[PDB]
């Protein structure tokens, strides 16, 4: 039939390393040794089989069955992906017909801690989820090709000849700081356990560079062992899940009020009796023991009524404009697999009820990433630096989306939300002035179910990082009792890790 045969073999390309921003390995192509066999040669050395089988960790008779059943094939795999050292002891047995191929297997040194961001490759070493998928072309490289001239009995007579070399993939350095990532991962997980919550997300970003410094979710999974992996655990919820932001968008409503020319911080709004009726609907505050609140007090008490009255006065168009311009419900440009854009509703003419509900964050849907980016722009004196999941060496120009004077005023109000009497004191960061806003969003007709939110930034004197904590369905639940302490603990550790000077460790009690 055939005197010879020409078999073609690909030379595997070394897949690009993924590191965090400091060069810590997050995805590594590690060398592995695959053993294959020519059964026609192996069948001439049967008395070596029990020793070979032992070296492979395989049952003597099952190994023998496998060879005998494939006795005519010129090629079977004995085992793929042993360690180089395990392969080295088998090669030393010098069994006829047993040969080795070096290939690579992806290893994820941080495991579940950064699994949602990094993703993973399939058995064919192709990116399937996360960054591995999004940057697959960058990471993959260009494999080579060999030619093997084989026998009529499958024995490779002519030594392989290399057609094309293997071109390695490119290194990729993420924006993530693995130190902050571990801190965020451990504090979110502990908070979930303490609160009996179903899921959660935590985003940390650099307000000055747009970099995503940490992005963790629960549940998570071990990418190095995906046996019994369930779909819910795979979700990078910070990017691919949407939620109503509720009270956490009130600083943007307040930004529109101050940009309107119609409102100044010392203005007061009468929110008594803690409710406001619009047709058949009643807007309700949680704490309903207030009458006059100034604009800062409306944020401290989180008065839906107060922000609603302001929204009626200034018009929803101005609030829509700020929310759109800080990115809520807008494409982020990151291109993360499955990333959601959410929804910021718009109208030619805004009905009165929807003007109020926009202003306190009902009925729009955002991602944790978007909410964090919005807070980063506010923290950065109103200038939005573009998002990045990769290390930023040369920072692109930002876009001024809130005037610096309005941004600075709203920043001070959010510092009061954390530090003033009656505010979110469990969000305070010891040694630092922190600023932010809690939220609690009921999942309407979705039976005693809520999300607890906190969004903020620090240090208030020169903001460095913005943070969003989302805790999904705690079993207690308020934003200020559930997500606020997580913000405090993670913000304190992250500021320390970044060597940020404390701006609230005075040694003297000053007066005023
Ligand atoms: C802002 O986010 C805003 N939230 C809402 O109006 C929305 N839902 O509100 C839910 C009620 O939320 C709370 C109730 C009670 C408390 C609280 N501190 N008191 C106790 C805590 C322990 C349990 N017993 C009560 C805190 C929050 C609701 O209506 O069920 C909302 C907006 S969009 C959407 N889908 N839902 C409020 C709650 C006014 N401010 O939020 S904040 O986090 O408290 O600052
Ligand atoms: Cl609190
Ligand atoms: Cl509601």
Residue numbers in the entry: 48 to 493, 500 to 529, 532 to 567
Excerpt from the publication:
The catalytic serine acting as a nucleophile in the transpeptidation mechanism is also able to react with β-lactam antibiotics because of their structural similarity with the d-Ala-d-Ala motif; the resulting covalent intermediate, however, has a very long half-life (with turn-over constant k3 ~ 10−4 M−1s−1 or less), effectively leading to irreversible inactivation. AiCuris previously reported on the development of a novel monobactam (AIC499), which shows remarkable inhibitory activity against PBPs of Gram-negative bacteria, and good antibacterial activity, even against clinical isolates harboring several β-lactamase classes.
In addition to the apo structures, PaPBP3ΔTM was produced and crystallized in the presence of AIC499; crystals belonged to space group P 21 21 21 with two copies per asymmetric unit and yielded diffraction data extending to a resolution of 1.7 Å. For the complex with the E. coli protein, the AIC499 molecule is covalently associated with PaPBP3ΔTM via the catalytic serine (S294) side chain. In the active site environment, the β3-β4 loop as well as the β5-α11 loop appear quite flexible, despite the presence of the ligand, as evidenced by high B-factors and often discontinuous electron density. Nevertheless, we note that strands β3 and β4 clearly bend towards the active site, supporting some interactions of their side chains with the AIC499 molecule, most importantly R489 (see below). Unlike the situation in the EcPBP3ΔTM:AIC499 complex, the amino-thiazole does not form a parallel π-π stack with Y409 (equivalent to Y419 in EcPBP3) but a displaced T-stack. The carboxyl group of the linker (R5) forms hydrogen bonds to the guanidinium group of R489, and the phenyl ring of the head group (R1) is close to the aliphatic side chain of V333.
